[PDB]
Design an enzyme around this catalytic site. Sequence first.
Site, short mmCIF file in Angstrom:
data_model
loop_
_atom_site.label_atom_id
_atom_site.label_comp_id
_atom_site.label_asym_id
_atom_site.label_seq_id
_atom_site.Cartn_x
_atom_site.Cartn_y
_atom_site.Cartn_z
N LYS A 185 0.93 -1.26 -0.15
CA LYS A 185 -0.06 -0.05 0.06
C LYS A 185 0.88 1.32 0.04
O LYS A 185 0.74 2.20 -0.72
CB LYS A 185 -1.06 0.11 1.21
N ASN B 66 -2.96 5.76 6.02
CA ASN B 66 -2.32 4.85 6.89
C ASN B 66 -0.68 4.85 6.66
O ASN B 66 0.02 4.48 7.50
CB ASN B 66 -2.76 3.43 6.64
N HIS C 56 -3.60 -9.29 10.47
CA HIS C 56 -4.72 -8.67 11.37
C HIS C 56 -5.62 -9.69 11.94
O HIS C 56 -6.60 -9.17 12.48
CB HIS C 56 -5.33 -7.64 10.66
C1 LIG Z 1 -3.02 0.56 14.36
C2 LIG Z 1 -3.27 1.86 13.43
O1 LIG Z 1 -4.12 1.87 12.55
N1 LIG Z 1 -2.33 2.57 13.08
C3 LIG Z 1 -2.25 3.73 12.35
C4 LIG Z 1 -3.04 5.04 12.85
O2 LIG Z 1 -1.84 5.58 13.74
P1 LIG Z 1 -2.63 6.13 15.34
O3 LIG Z 1 -1.53 6.50 16.26
O4 LIG Z 1 -3.31 6.96 15.31
O5 LIG Z 1 -2.99 4.46 15.99
P2 LIG Z 1 -4.34 4.43 17.13
O6 LIG Z 1 -5.59 4.17 16.48
O7 LIG Z 1 -4.09 5.28 18.20
O8 LIG Z 1 -3.82 2.89 17.66
C5 LIG Z 1 -2.61 2.89 17.90
C6 LIG Z 1 -2.39 1.52 18.97
O9 LIG Z 1 -3.12 1.92 20.26
C7 LIG Z 1 -3.84 0.91 20.73
N2 LIG Z 1 -5.03 1.38 21.30
C8 LIG Z 1 -5.66 2.42 20.41
C9 LIG Z 1 -6.79 3.05 20.73
C10 LIG Z 1 -7.42 2.60 22.16
O10 LIG Z 1 -8.45 3.34 22.90
N3 LIG Z 1 -6.90 1.58 22.78
C11 LIG Z 1 -5.56 1.07 22.43
O11 LIG Z 1 -4.74 0.12 23.16
C12 LIG Z 1 -4.20 0.39 19.48
O12 LIG Z 1 -4.65 -0.84 19.68
C13 LIG Z 1 -3.20 0.63 18.49
O13 LIG Z 1 -2.43 -0.70 18.36
O14 LIG Z 1 -3.37 5.92 12.23
C14 LIG Z 1 -2.09 6.55 11.53
C15 LIG Z 1 -2.64 7.46 10.69
O15 LIG Z 1 -3.75 7.19 9.70
C16 LIG Z 1 -1.48 5.60 10.67
O16 LIG Z 1 -0.40 5.88 9.89
C17 LIG Z 1 -1.14 4.44 11.64
O17 LIG Z 1 -0.54 3.26 10.94
C18 LIG Z 1 0.61 2.29 11.31
C19 LIG Z 1 1.86 2.53 10.41
C20 LIG Z 1 -0.25 0.84 11.42
O18 LIG Z 1 0.50 0.01 11.84
N4 LIG Z 1 -1.04 0.67 10.80
C21 LIG Z 1 -1.79 -0.88 10.65
C22 LIG Z 1 -3.26 -0.85 10.40
C23 LIG Z 1 -1.06 -1.41 9.44
O19 LIG Z 1 -0.67 -0.87 8.60
O20 LIG Z 1 -1.17 -2.81 9.36
N1 LIG Z 2 2.69 -6.32 -3.46
C1 LIG Z 2 3.46 -6.89 -2.59
N2 LIG Z 2 3.32 -8.19 -2.11
C2 LIG Z 2 3.76 -8.73 -1.03
N3 LIG Z 2 4.92 -7.91 -0.36
C3 LIG Z 2 4.91 -6.79 -1.00
C4 LIG Z 2 4.39 -5.95 -1.88
N4 LIG Z 2 4.65 -4.78 -2.14
C5 LIG Z 2 5.88 -4.58 -1.20
N5 LIG Z 2 5.84 -5.67 -0.40
C6 LIG Z 2 6.39 -5.66 0.97
O1 LIG Z 2 5.31 -5.24 1.88
C7 LIG Z 2 6.03 -4.73 3.03
C8 LIG Z 2 5.44 -3.53 3.28
O2 LIG Z 2 5.29 -2.68 2.09
P1 LIG Z 2 4.55 -1.32 1.79
O3 LIG Z 2 4.56 -0.93 0.52
O4 LIG Z 2 4.77 -0.45 2.91
O5 LIG Z 2 3.18 -1.88 2.10
P2 LIG Z 2 1.92 -1.56 3.33
O6 LIG Z 2 1.72 -0.10 3.60
O7 LIG Z 2 0.90 -2.23 2.94
O8 LIG Z 2 2.47 -2.34 4.57
C9 LIG Z 2 7.65 -4.42 2.85
O9 LIG Z 2 8.13 -5.73 3.47
C10 LIG Z 2 7.55 -4.73 1.26
O10 LIG Z 2 9.00 -5.13 0.43
MN LIG Z 3 -1.79 -3.89 7.96
#
Ligand SMILES: CC(=O)N[C@H]1[C@@H](OP(=O)(O)OP(=O)(O)OC[C@H]2O[C@@H](n3ccc(=O)[nH]c3=O)[C@H](O)[C@@H]2O)O[C@H](CO)[C@@H](O)[C@@H]1O[C@H](C)C(=O)N[C@@H](C)C(=O)O
Ligand SMILES: Nc1ncnc2c1ncn2[C@@H]1O[C@H](COP(=O)(O)OP(=O)(O)O)[C@@H](O)[C@H]1O
Ligand SMILES: [Mn+2]
Length: 430
Positions: A115, A138, A183
């Site tokens: 993504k 995200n 997830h």
């Molecule tokens: C867990 C998640 O969705 N994170 C995204 C979120 O960040 P943010 O700091 O706002 O997260 P949040 O909703 O406060 O949650 C963070 C952590 O706090 C814990 N949490 C949150 C709320 C609450 O009441 N209780 C609790 O325990 C959560 O379970 C969570 O694991 O909003 C940001 C802006 O949109 C994103 O960049 C960020 O992505 C990260 C990098 C992530 O890990 N996302 C997941 C979904 C992924 O990519 O797999």
């Molecule tokens: N299309 C794909 N399929 C599987 N793995 C991928 C793909 N594109 C990137 N990766 C791997 O996904 C992981 C996170 O990539 P990223 O571009 O940040 O995706 P996301 O934001 O969904 O996690 C990195 O380890 C990267 O090498």
């Molecule tokens: Mn994810």
Amino acid sequence: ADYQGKNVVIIGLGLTGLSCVDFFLARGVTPRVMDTRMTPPGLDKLPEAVERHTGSLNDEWLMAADLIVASPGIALAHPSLSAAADAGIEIVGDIELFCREAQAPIVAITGSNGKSTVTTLVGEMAKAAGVNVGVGGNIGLPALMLLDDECELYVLELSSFQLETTSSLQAVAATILNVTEDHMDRYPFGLQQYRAAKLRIYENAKVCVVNADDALTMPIERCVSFGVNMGDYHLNHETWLRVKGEKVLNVKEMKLSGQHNYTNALAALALADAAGLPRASSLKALTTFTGLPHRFEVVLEHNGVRWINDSKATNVGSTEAALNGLHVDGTLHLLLGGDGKSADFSPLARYLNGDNVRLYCFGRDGAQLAALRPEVAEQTETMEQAMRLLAPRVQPGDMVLLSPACASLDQFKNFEQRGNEFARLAKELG
Ligand SMILES: CC(=O)N[C@H]1[C@@H](OP(=O)(O)OP(=O)(O)OC[C@H]2O[C@@H](n3ccc(=O)[nH]c3=O)[C@H](O)[C@@H]2O)O[C@H](CO)[C@@H](O)[C@@H]1O[C@H](C)C(=O)N[C@@H](C)C(=O)O
Ligand SMILES: Nc1ncnc2c1ncn2[C@@H]1O[C@H](COP(=O)(O)OP(=O)(O)O)[C@@H](O)[C@H]1O
Ligand SMILES: [Mn+2]
């Protein structure tokens, strides 16, 4: 939309929650904010006029709300939030609020992996065309912080969690890049529930872009498709990106490599085309884009050893993509571990056979990963301990790969901290 005089409750004091606080305050609405964490990371950045509740969800606040704004990190299935929904209290997330306000087309990108890469690519394609583009979601810059009347195109990375609470997205172009197990700690009805969350992205999308090689990306006129051997956008051969049989780019011109990055380029071109971006400049951007930090990123190449920060490999699919076909002249020292989000790590084991693979497994689910092949596996509490363990053993030709197949939040602020830690330790030890 209009929120004046409403009782607005925000759940989550992280990045999202703080951007929502600022959003309402700038609109003349003082929200209240809660978080189940006792000391959430954003507590210190909260405006002093804003009421906050920590350590639990406060049902007095929720059951009184006109509007509940749920951060993606709280499950809609949380009993307090489920009760509010049973009462008919409206629940949205920050991406819902953004969509209600956004006045430029939105390209929306979800999927288990790729993504941020595809989101950044489409952003670079728009920049190459001289479009004023806002890139966020995200990927890490909260979408509400993008809202700008000069902005001409929004490119949003969307998680499945964000999509659960979104109902007003009508994307100019939307994609699910792929659906593989991730997830599962948040989806008690398994892969199809997770998939259903992602399929919401196509609702009211002008163009839908699917992965011809991944049936789970397809919704129920037809979507555009991208794929390796098939799709409206596909690969030829030397490798070429093609669109319906016509060559558009020899991937020797790209700075990224790896088959999944070629199909990421195809998806990005499909979305850019659908958003109306000129293809010439879109192809240009494909040649300039160098790759994101933490996504299979070489952070040190010294003494014949490559230390590779793939901290953003946070599930089995991404670590699979790193390992599948990987060339290492000596031994692969593979760092695995963290919060495994109830993943079955078994599909990795078929990559970890043979004489030149060492595993160093750590974090919450370290034991689970060491079990993939116990005879070549070490388990430590922390990544730093694993690195200080492996570092003495490293020989010219080896690769040290952090591709942990796990989220980082059991031990780190974020995956960037985990990647930056790995890079600091590689510099020290390599
Ligand atoms: C867990 C998640 O969705 N994170 C995204 C979120 O960040 P943010 O700091 O706002 O997260 P949040 O909703 O406060 O949650 C963070 C952590 O706090 C814990 N949490 C949150 C709320 C609450 O009441 N209780 C609790 O325990 C959560 O379970 C969570 O694991 O909003 C940001 C802006 O949109 C994103 O960049 C960020 O992505 C990260 C990098 C992530 O890990 N996302 C997941 C979904 C992924 O990519 O797999
Ligand atoms: N299309 C794909 N399929 C599987 N793995 C991928 C793909 N594109 C990137 N990766 C791997 O996904 C992981 C996170 O990539 P990223 O571009 O940040 O995706 P996301 O934001 O969904 O996690 C990195 O380890 C990267 O090498
Ligand atoms: Mn994810």
